[PDB]
Amino acid sequence: VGAXAXVXWXWXWXWX
Amino acid sequence: VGAXAXVXWXWXWXWX
Numbered sequence: 001v002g003a004x005a006x007v008x009w010x011w012x013w014x015w016x
Numbered sequence: 017v018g019a020x021a022x023v024x025w026x027w028x029w030x031w032x
Binding site for chain 2: 001002003004005006008010
């Protein structure tokens with residue numbers, strides 16, 4: 001959960 | 017995987 005890969009920002013889910 | 021919570025930086029596993 002956060003900024004990088006996963007849930008949040010960058011990659012995986014959420015935004016970028 | 018990254019900066020926030022999870023594997024990498026901040027919280028969960030790795031560094032901070």
